[PDB]
Every structure is written in C-alpha cells, then in structure tokens.
Design a protein around this nucleic acid. Structure first.
Lengths: 205, 82, 171, 62, 85
RNA sequence: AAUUGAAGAGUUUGAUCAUGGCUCAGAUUGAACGCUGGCGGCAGGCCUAACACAUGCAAGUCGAACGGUAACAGGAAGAAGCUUGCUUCUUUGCUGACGAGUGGCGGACGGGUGAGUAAUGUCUGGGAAACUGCCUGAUGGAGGGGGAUAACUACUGGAAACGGUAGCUAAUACCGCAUAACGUCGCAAGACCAAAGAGGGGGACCUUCGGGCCUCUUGCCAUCGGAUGUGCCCAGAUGGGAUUAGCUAGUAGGUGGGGUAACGGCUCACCUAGGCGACGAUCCCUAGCUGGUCUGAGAGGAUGACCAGCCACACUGGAACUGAGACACGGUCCAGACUCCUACGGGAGGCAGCAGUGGGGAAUAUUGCACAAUGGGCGCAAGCCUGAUGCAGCCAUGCCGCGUGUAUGAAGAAGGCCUUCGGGUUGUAAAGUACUUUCAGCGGGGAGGAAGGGAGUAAAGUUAAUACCUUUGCUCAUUGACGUUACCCGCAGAAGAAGCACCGGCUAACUCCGUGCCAGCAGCCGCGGUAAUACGGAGGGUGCAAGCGUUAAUCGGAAUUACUGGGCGUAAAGCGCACGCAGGCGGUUUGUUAAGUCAGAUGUGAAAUCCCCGGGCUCAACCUGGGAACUGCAUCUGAUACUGGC
C-alpha cells in the first residue's frame, strides 16, 4: 500500500516540490527537476481538461502518500460533510495522523513520519496508535514514545522542522515531543499549486 | 407464555444484548412484542452499559410475564428505587 | 468397537495422516520401522473422455495419499505426470474407470528420469531456486513440492545449485 | 458455436477441451466468442511476455 | 422409527381406540333421539333426550365432544322435539 | 439538523446540420476465469439437479406420577477382607440413584428449502360469526368407590424386525357414583356436567399408632377474565400473454336438516336461474410475498442471497389419528418409484437438520470444539438434552485497515535503451553510509465475555413450631468451547513479503527493432502490403496495488417507451374515408351535496437497514445510544374556489 519507489521521479512529473525528499536540505533540484520526468520528459505535453483535472488530484495524493481506494472514500466523506467539499477534503487529508506528525516535525518527510506511526513510535491522548490513517480530532495530543524518545532520526528531524514554514492550527514542543491539534486548519492558512475545484470536478460522473 | 429475555445482537466476541418481551416459543432473535431496555456485557467502565424500562417490565410481569435468569440478574443488579 | 494390541484399526485420512505416522496418548516418539521407497517413472495420462478434469486429477489426488503411486503436476495446468510404484501403472487406468471416477485415460512417454525428490528449507534462497530452475519445477497433490529432471547429470547439477536440502521422498 | 483462438499458435486439435469466454471479433462474422487461452486443455501462447494475463502465460522467471 | 417416541405412537393408538369407542357410543345415544324424532313419539323422544344429555355433557367435560358442541346438540334437539310435538 | 443534487465522448459524409442506432468512461455482484499473491479485522460462501445419498449426530426429560428393581453407591439382622477396628461377604432396593416398562409434558419450538402458489399467498386498512398448552387475575371446589393393564411370570412362532396366547399388579392411566354454580340446554319450569394426588416435614391428642391429624410447599377441577398464539371475513394493491373472448351444475342465491371451535354450500334436500367477464374473467407462460437491496439528480429501472415478518414444502400422491395446537422433515396408515438386510419364510429406509459423498456446473467450505454465554424442551431443584447458538477450519469472494522499509547518497557507476554521437535517459533509483523494526518468527507476562449455581449463618416472611420451603445479605470452595485468547513487554535483523492492466483517438501515458494485408490486435472507429507511437519483443512511461485484468449480469449515461421527459409534410411514424356504442372530455349562472380536493386531529405504517449527531473496538469496516424518515392507509371533525352528483 505504501509507494516504495523513486520520489523525485514523481516530483518531476507533478512539476512541483512534493516534500518527499525534505530531510536535511529541501527545495529539490539536484534531480534535473521537471526537465526529464521520463525518457521523453523534455516534451511539451499540452494536456486535456481531463489531463490537468487528473494531475491535480494525482499530485494531492503523492504530496500525502494516500492511495486511490482510500482517497475516494475521503472525497465521499468530504462531499457528505456540509461546506466546501474541496476544503473539507483538505481538512480530512490534514487530519491524518502521519500528516499531523510530519507537520509537528517529529519526522523529516511524511514518508518518514509514517515509519514511526506504524512502528508504534507515537500515540494519541495516551493510547498508542499503530495505524497511519488515524483521524486526529481537535484537542487530541500526539507525543513521541516515552520509551523511544529523541533518537538519531527524530532529533535531526525536529531541526529543520523548526526551520520550515511552521503551522498555525497546532502547538508543538521540543523536549516534550508532544503537540496538540488546536483546531482544524482553515482553507486560508494552507495553500499551494493545489486547486480544489479541479479535484472535486474529477469525481462527478 | 410471555417472557422477557436476552437477544444477542452484538458482533463476534463483542456481544450486545437486548432485553425484550416475546413469545417463549419464538427464536432468540425472532419476533417480539416490544423492546425494553438493553444490556452491555462490555462497556468498560465509563458512563453506561445498562438501561431498562422498569415501569414497563413490571407492567408485563403483572400481565403474567416470566423473566429470564440473566434478565432478573440485571433487574435486581440495577436495584429498584435507588 | 474398541481395540487391543495386535489388532488393526482404521481412521480417516484428511492430509493429516501419512505413512509411519505414530499415534500415542502423549509420549512424543516415532516408530523406526516403515520402508517408504522412491518411484521410477514414465506416463502422462492425458485422458480420453475429453475432460473433465477432477475425476482424473481428483482421482489422481486421491489415489496418491495412498502409498502405491503419487502424481506430479507441473506448472502448466495440463501435462499430468504420475509416478510410479514399479511398472503396474494399470490399476491407475482401472481405478480411473472404477472406484468413483468415470474417466478413461491412456499413456505416453515422458522426458523424465527422476524422480524427484521434493524440496524445502530456508526462505529467500528457495524463492531464488523456485525461480531459476522453475521450468522444470513441479507441484504435487498435497500442494508441494518437487522438481522433475531429464536425466542423472541434470539431476546432479540441480542439487549442485546448493546448499538447500535433500533427496526427500516421504509417502 | 464457433470461437476465436487468440495469440500466435495454439495446441488445440481434434477434440480437446476449452473454456469459451465470449466477446466478438468483427473480421469473421458469426464468431461472437473467444476461447480463454491457458484454460483447461488449452495451452497458453509460447514465449509471450506482455499482457500475459490474457493469452494465459505464467511469469517467465523474472 | 428408531426414536423413543414411537411409544408415543403406540400410546396414541390406544388413545385412538378408546376414543373411537366413547365417541361411537355417544353418537348412537344421539341417534336414539333422532330415530325418536323421525318416528315422532314425543314421550319417547323426551326420554331418549334425558338419557343422552348427561352422556353428552360428560364427554364434553372429558374433552372429545368439546364444549358448546354439546350445547348445539342439545339445543337443536330441543328446538326440534317440541316444534311439531 | 434529519433526501439540496443532474458533465459527455467515438462512429453515416468530400464536407455540413438534423435524425438514429451501435460503442465507450461510472456505480454495482453470493460471481467465475487468467496472471499474481504477505498479514489481520468483519462479513460472505450450491445462484446449477425440489438429483440421488454410505456414516455419526441433529429431542428428549421428570421416581417430590406408579409398579419397581437390571447397574454403580451408602449402610444392614448375621458371618467376617481381617490390619479387633478400620474395613470385607451371603443376600437385602430400606436411602441417594437408576437399565427396562406405565404415566405426565415436549416431539406443531428450534433448524432446512423455494418445489408449488398470480392469489385458500403476501403487503396495506378494516371487520364479525371463534379457540387458546405452558404463564397469569378472581371465586370456589377437591367427597367416595369400582374394573383393567404394561412391566413381570408360564408357555410359544421368529434369521432378524417383531411378536403371539394365559395369568398377576400400581398410579396424577381408565371408568361410574356423590356433589353444581356466577356454566350448558330450555322463554320459564326445572333438567344436566367435574376433579389427583405426590412431597419436606411436626407440637396436641393420638385411633385399627399404615400415618390419621395441624401446616407450608407444589399439582388437579369448575366458571368469568388478562396476556399470548392461532383460525375466519371484506376492500385496495401485488408478473406477462388476446397469435387465450368467454368461463361456471354445488355453479349463484334462498328455505330447512346435518356439520364445525367458529361464519359459510362446508355438506345434503328442495326451490328460484343465477354467478363471473374486456376496470380483461377463463386459459396458457412465469413466479414465493414484504421490510428492503443495487442503480438513479430525481421520477423511475432492476432485484428480493445473507438479516427479520408472513406463507409453503419436507422421497411422489392420498388419508386420517393423537393432541391446546399437526393432517405432522428426524409420527402412523395406503398406494407409487427406488434402495438395503435376509437362514428366504420375511423385513427396513428418505440429509430441502449439521458435517460429508456422488452427480451436474464456469463456480460455492470442515465428516472441527463446546453447552462457558444467550435462548429453548423436561424438572420443585440440582440437573439432563440442545451441530439452535456460541466458536473454530477452508477460500483474496468481498469490504476495511497494515506491511513489504525510513533518512542520506554522485556531473550522477556498470549494464539496458535512444543518439543528428556532442549527449540524453533509466536515476537518489542501486551501491555506499547512517537508521527504524510494526507485521510476521521465537520467548515471557496476561484483561473481558462470569452471571449464577453448590455447601453454612440472620428476616413482625408464614406456621403449633427454632425444623421444612421461600427470601435477602453474609462466608468458603468452585463455574468456560474459543485457548500456545485479545492485549502488554523483550530478543533478532532490512531481515520474510509486488504484482497486473495500459501508452493511435475517446483516454493519463513513447521511441528502437523485428515483421510485412504475413503473423496478428480490436470495446467502437480503426491498424499491418518496407522506417507501424495500433502487431511481437525491448527501453521508457501512464494508471491501480494484494490485487490487477478479462468475461458475465443489473442500473446509468439512453430525453434510446420521454409521468417528470420525445416524436409522426420529406428522417421510423396520421387508420383510404365517414357514422358511431363503451370509454375520455365538456359552454354558462344559482341553490344543494361535499365524494375527488384541501386543513387539523387520532390510530397505524415491527425491529434491522438508509439519514442526522453522538458513543464504544488503537482507526476504519464492524458495534451501538437517541432522533428523523417510513413520502402510505383508515376513522373523526372542519373548508368549499375548482372538480363530480343532485
């Protein structure tokens, strides 16, 4: 279910930084970015309404690590939930445990963030959580395992974690290695090349 | 012969019973007269796990309804007036 | 009834019993007797009755948890090989239209000297083995295992791929 | 009924047995059916390495 | 049929027989009165009637001729016997 | 708060617009097949032959009903294994108990299947002519005798299955008699009907000292009820076919006997001559019905596996019996087809109960564990029975989770691939370097489903009573299939784990070579006869992922049966014309009615599901609390413009 493949390969095809390599140094390059996604990648792919309408959601996935069978469900949920289905969808995607982890900078990438959550390196309100898909409520508190706290990985992660854009809707710490989800992130305090109207549009027919 | 008994609806390993008035000859999950309260054999310890409409139960009893052993082992377990 | 030493009792084999399977009330030990030797070969029952197909196969994967013969079904679904007490491959044909299978079945010659010999041990290495010389590799009624070789030299080189296990016949 | 035999080459002969799939071919009218390769008495296309699901060939030892 | 309740069957056979007898007698005891009606002798009718009435009610309480079946029999007897007689 | 959600594209032509079919993208499945395949949670699993079935089990239980002893157990008047004090014997059924039998209750529940059934069915809403075991409320009754009978015994035919004659014995078995009302009959008079005892005990007195007697506990009878369940009746609705247009003698109704628990042609007799039908009877074809389920923006279309209600069948056909209830899956009788045992004279059986075998088929499971929980039958109770149920096995069949590593890494290796050779690409991908070990493997610790029951103590409980019984606290020992449980913690080490379809257009995704209208692909259009982005291989890419593809099938798109929502001058389509019955529709004004219509109310529309907001399994699927919804029907009271009647 996990990707398990070249990350930069996806980064160049989506044409933006998917934060897959985040780690020590960020903002990509050193891959020949965007100029050769394939062997033919130097091509000038004029693409269909459908094509972009795909590339959008298909990027939103890769930037998280969720796969289709799940993503669809997510969308369904969003649709069911009153309010803009795009921003709801983003809400759901941002409510994922692994996400809340990478966001709180307990790991370099969201890919690294997963390793922990699955390896039972974290918890919720004090029960340990194995599943990467856990939906994080407000007021919930995620904490690195008391048992394995501050290791050769997560320590170096917190480093540039502090050096990122940093979030709003959550409250982080250093030595406690725990954080609270204060509120569900608004549409305004997160954004990118990401378009909601493209992705909600894709699932219609 | 009317009986107030337990029907097992819950799930594998995690039963959720339901206390219910029914004809004794019927099936456990079969046709019944009405639902009165319920029982939760798990519930952990938080807020809940058993409810019964006692005023109804006694109405049926007085209409000559028998009670299952577990059922009464609920009814007096929840006490009566306190 | 109920039995005493020296009698002969019958049970009900469902892939649980083999040959020489010792049964106690608890004492973990196994009787050093029972021969169990290895088959020669030939065959390819390819069936008249133009199929089915189980009843033939079912017939074969039911005369085979018995001790006489034993089948061999390669990884090409068809191509059914049987091997092979001595040379009386006839009871097979006959139990192919008696017992409870209305099949008919005949024979041919098959490029198989061995026999084979049915292998397993540690992982990964085996998956590299069950891949390189798989051409070439079979699977039996009872869901394992076996090779099937063309001669003796091609038998030696196979094992010589090495170093993972016997020999194994076990009936 | 008549049925189509896909791929290059087949072991089929006088009697044999097959499993008829269905779906037509409009080159040869009257053939509304396909025989599933590698099913029953049918052998799969020899040496086929691509889209082997159809034409019924097992992994050629990756 | 190789279930211990075949004794229930032989039991019900006995029962059967017994009932067949009782019932039979009852019905003949009514037929007396019916014959008395067709022959038309009012006294004889009344007699017969008084003879059957307890034998009816009795079998009613004994659970063959049950309940108001008895009632019917006596009622539609009486409504007849004194109708033309 | 609780239905607020609608996409189009390809193909007729030299081209165009319109018509119109075909095809494609979606969702769905009890699926199958091909390639592949590592976990776990939950659910699902003969759709085909209502085809035939070896073997085990699927219904028994009460000695507080009775005669009783065939077994294990305590003790016995006497002898003793004898280790004179414990134990051992002949018998002994006195006690606990219990083989066989009698009787009571249960075998009509529970489980299976969809054969039959176009309405003795179902769904919805009303109704009048009934019954109801066990559980209940109330008022009284339970007096006294009789005759049999299994078992048993003696003969006796039997290969077996089974019995056959005679005789003896008990009961809550069976039968009179007594007693009878608030019951039945009858206008009344008056007539007529019942029953059963068995236990734990115990102060008087005690008599023929069996136990009478006092008492509580349980059981019997009669009548009126409660509840439950089951009959019966009416209307409306519940497939197709007119290339089925007429059907029907108990048929339709009446009167009267009979009958049933109850109305009734249900039956019989007689008397009228009707009854049904194009608002489609009749006859054929098909089919279990519903809650609901999939799809759909909705209206609808399709569908009724799993789950719950109703029905029906239980080898084919027929019939009764017993009983509260059956016209009875594991009862009986008869016939029919088959099969099995036989010492040949004669018998025995029905998996559409669980599991399984053969058969059929593209295809659908273990001859498992346990009564611990829930629930049912018997019992005062302990208890006994229980493939119901709870669990386990198999299968990617599905849904939902998770893993198969995470960081770092170079002008960026070798190799593969394209190259106008300058290089580009596979590609941070690998290596290498650090790092983490869930899930698996091994090893330790260890919740919850468990509530009661079994022995002793106290209760203005009742009692003549501290015994007995019930009750409520208390004390002790104890109660599980799953089960090496869930879950927790260590050990080891990237260690064990990625495949499938696709890349001409719809449609995300490209070139080389091979081949050459050959081999071959294709869902539609359409590729291939010498540079094929379409075939086959390779590189690369795109899309999904323990699955991916193909086939199959339902709805969608399809306004392509158009109620919402279409058409007919020439594209398919106005009868050749006219009259006209039924049917549909009808100018205008007042009065009335108030059915249609509308408003309010009251019943009802089962639970589950769907939906809303919560809650619990680490999340999810799953489980669950409450609410809405069930768009409908019926009755009552109102409004009256339109509609209909007068």
């Amino acid at each position: 279910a996990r990707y398990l493949g070249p990350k930069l390969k996806l980064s160049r095809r989506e044409g933006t930084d998917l934060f897959l390599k985040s780690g020590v140094r960020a903002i990509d390059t050193k891959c020949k970015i965007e100029q050769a996604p394939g062997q033919h990648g130097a091509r000038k792919p004029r693409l269909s309404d459908y094509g972009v309408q795909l590339r959008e959601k298909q990027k939103v996935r890769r930037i998280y690590g969720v796969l289709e069978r799940q993503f669809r469900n997510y969308y369904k949920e969003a649709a069911r939930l009153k309010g803009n289905t795009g921003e709801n969808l983003l809400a759901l995607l941002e409510g994922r445990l692994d996400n809340v982890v990478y966001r709180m900078g307990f790991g370099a990438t969201r890919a690294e963030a997963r390793q922990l959550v699955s390896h039972k390196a974290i918890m919720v309100n004090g029960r340990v959580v194995n599943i990467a898909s856990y939906q994080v409520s407000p007021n919930d508190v995620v904490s690195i395992r008391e048992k394995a706290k501050k290791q050769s990985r997560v320590k170096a992660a917190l480093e540039l974690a502090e050096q990122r854009e940093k979030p709003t809707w959550l409250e982080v710490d250093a030595g406690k290695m725990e954080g609270t989800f204060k509120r569900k992130p608004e549409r305004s305090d997160l954004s990118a090349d990401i378009n909601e109207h493209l992705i909600v549009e894709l699932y219609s027919k | 012969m009317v009986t107030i008994r337990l029907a097992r609806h819950g799930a594998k390993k995690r039963p959720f019973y339901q206390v219910v008035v029914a004809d004794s000859r019927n099936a456990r999950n079969g046709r019944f007269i009405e639902r009165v309260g319920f029982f939760n054999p798990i519930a952990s310890e938080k807020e809940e796990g058993t409810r019964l409409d006692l005023d109804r139960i006694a109405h049926w009893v007085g209409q000559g309804a028998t009670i299952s052993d577990r059922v009464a082992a609920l009814i007096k377990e929840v006490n009566k007036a306190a | 009834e109920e039995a005493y030493p020296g009698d002969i009792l019958g049970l009900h084999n469902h892939g649980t019993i083999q040959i020489g399977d010792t049964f106690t009330q608890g004492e973990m030990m196994k009787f050093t007797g029972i021969p169990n030797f290895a088959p020669e070969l030939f065959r390819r029952i390819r069936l008249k009755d133009p199929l089915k197909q189980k009843q033939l196969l079912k017939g074969l994967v039911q005369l085979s948890e018995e001790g006489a013969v034993q089948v061999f079904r390669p990884i090409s679904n068809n191509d059914l090989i049987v091997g092979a007490v001595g040379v009386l491959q006839f009871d097979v044909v006959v139990a192919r239209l008696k017992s409870e299978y209305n099949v008919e079945a005949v024979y041919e010659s098959v490029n198989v000297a061995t026999a084979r010999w049915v292998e397993c041990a540690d992982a990964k290495k085996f998956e590299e083995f069950k891949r390189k010389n798989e051409s070439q590799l079979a699977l039996d009624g009872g869901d394992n295992l076996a090779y099937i070789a063309t001669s003796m030299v091609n038998l030696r080189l196979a094992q010589e791929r090495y170093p993972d296990v016997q020999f194994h016949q076990t009936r | 009924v008549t049925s189509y035999i896909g791929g290059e080459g087949h072991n089929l002969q006088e009697h044999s047995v097959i499993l008829i799939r269905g779906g037509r071919v409009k080159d040869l009218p009257g053939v509304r059916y396909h025989t599933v390769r590698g099913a029953l008495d049918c052998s799969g296309v020899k040496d086929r390495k691509q889209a082997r699901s159809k034409y019924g060939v097992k992994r050629p030892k990756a | 049929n190789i279930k211990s309740a075949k004794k229930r069957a032989i039991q019900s056979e006995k029962a059967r027989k017994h009932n067949a007898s009782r019932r039979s007698m009852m019905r003949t005891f009514i037929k007396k009165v019916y014959a008395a009606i067709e022959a038309g002798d009012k006294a004889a009718a009344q007699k017969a009637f008084n003879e059957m009435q307890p034998i009816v009610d009795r079998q009613a309480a004994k659970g063959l001729i049950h309940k108001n079946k008895a009632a019917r029999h006596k009622a539609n007897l009486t409504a007849q016997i004194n109708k033309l007689a």
